[PDB]
Structure 1
Amino acid sequence: SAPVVGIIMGSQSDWETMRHADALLTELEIPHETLIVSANRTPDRLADYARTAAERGLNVIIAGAGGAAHLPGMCAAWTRLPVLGVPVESRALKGMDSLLSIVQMPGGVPVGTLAIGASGAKNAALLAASILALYNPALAARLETWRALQTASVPNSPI
């Protein structure tokens, strides 16, 4: 029941993208929390969140943000837990700024980065699931089923 994955995003505007991560975790029945935490507007909120994540029982953190996206990297700076980053598509630069701001972390503080947008949010949840599956047999089986259904469901010819 207690969350094992924390999904945080820079603002309400990121929800359209991050809701895909939320839906996936719920689909795989992975207990999680979904919050808004701004690296630039609520720095102390982020510090406290990242710093106490492990103590609170979180295993993986999924962070999404756009533009000069500092949320994933700064979160990783305060926690020992694996942090996965989702570059949210920005208006002007289409998420290229989001992507470079997240993926280019210097050696020492990693952020597992996923694709720009919805695909990335969905994959961050799946990646978090694959991480949890390493020590949760029941979940591992549900993930196997999920991947199996995905593969088996691809049509053979276009409509």
Structure 2
Amino acid sequence: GARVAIVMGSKSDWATMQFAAEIFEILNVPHHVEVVSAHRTPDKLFSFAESAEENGYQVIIAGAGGAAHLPGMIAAKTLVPVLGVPVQSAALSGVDSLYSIVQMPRGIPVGTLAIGKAGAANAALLAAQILATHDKELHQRLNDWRKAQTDEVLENPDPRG
């Protein structure tokens, strides 16, 4: 039963959002992936948001670039926690994406992660850490993964050839 949904504004955002899905495959977390555009498919955004709780979603990861309205508009139509990922734009290098997602007004929150693929991965890890509060097995797998990252750095202290 998929407890987290990964949505994005364009299929072109998959370059970035695929990094969220990758973490879920490693940690073995069931998820739904879908393209929902705030500007090109506004009515689908509403229907999606309104039915998120019924479909069992406990966390939603939304990514978008430029005038990134996707994460914020989903959060306005549901009480399910929303995490936003700023996709790096061409002209402004993602600064516009970040400002559009992070500067939400009092009342409707969106947990924002880094700009780019690093943020997509982190959004996935954050959602996993949220689920892991009530999933001892996932909590254990997260623990092992984090130890693997640490150990890889510890067993390779010298960067020189």
TM range (shorter): over 0.9
2:50 is the counterpart of 1:54: no
Question: Which amino acid in the other structure matches residue 38 of structure 2?
Answer: A
| Equivalence for 2:97 | 98
- The CA distance in 1 between the partners of 2:157 and 2:50, in whole Å, is 48
Long gaps (5+) in structure 1: none
| Equivalence for 2:36 | 37
- The CA distance in 2 between the partners of 1:128 and 1:84, in whole Å, is 8
Q: Alpha carbon RMSD of aligned pairs, Å?
A: 0.7
- The CA distance in 2 between the partners of 1:151 and 1:107, in whole Å, is 37
Q: Aligned runs of 1:5-154 on 2, under 5 Å?
A: 5-154=4-153
CA shift at 1:152, angstroms?
Answer: 1.1
- The CA distance in 1 between the partners of 2:50 and 2:159, in whole Å, is 49
Question: Which amino acid in the other structure matches residue 60 of structure 1?
Answer: V
Q: Deviations over 1:1-34 (max 9, x none)?
A: x211000000011000000001111111111001
Aligned length: 158
- The CA distance in 2 between the partners of 1:148 and 1:71, in whole Å, is 34
- The CA distance in 2 between the partners of 1:117 and 1:51, in whole Å, is 28
Q: Deviations over 1:51-95 (max 9, x none)?
A: 110111011000000000000000111110110000000010000
- The CA distance in 1 between the partners of 2:12 and 2:45, in whole Å, is 18
Long gaps (5+) in structure 2: none
CA shift at 1:149, angstroms?
Answer: 0.8
Give TM-score, length-normalised by structure 1.
0.98
- The CA distance in 2 between the partners of 1:45 and 1:150, in whole Å, is 39
What SS class does the counterpart of residue 7 from structure 1 fall into?
Answer: strand
Question: Which amino acid in the other structure matches residue 126 of structure 2?
Answer: L
Give TM-score, length-normalised by structure 2.
0.96
